[PDB]
Amino acid sequence: MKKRLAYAIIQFLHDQLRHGGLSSDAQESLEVAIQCLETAFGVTVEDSDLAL
Amino acid sequence: MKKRLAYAIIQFLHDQLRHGGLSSDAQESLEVAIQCLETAFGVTVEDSDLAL
């Protein structure tokens, strides 16, 4: 797996939540994607409260 | 998020699903992440009927 690139992407997406100014619908789907990606690539960026 | 980058990211994730050597749990999470990113950013790569 390309763990470092995936981790870069996870950090980028986390930042989109906080600094990206996305729509609420996009935000909901993005939150889920981030949680799923952290499981997929076995790496996290700490954030309460993303549930997973 | 810029659509060009969203597209490239989702293409990378699709490639990791098929070539990343991820565990079964991780693969499932990745498939769902792809659905979520397609929805979040308004571009399609896998275009699963499962995407909500």
Ligand SMILES: [Cl-]
């Ligand atoms: Cl496929």
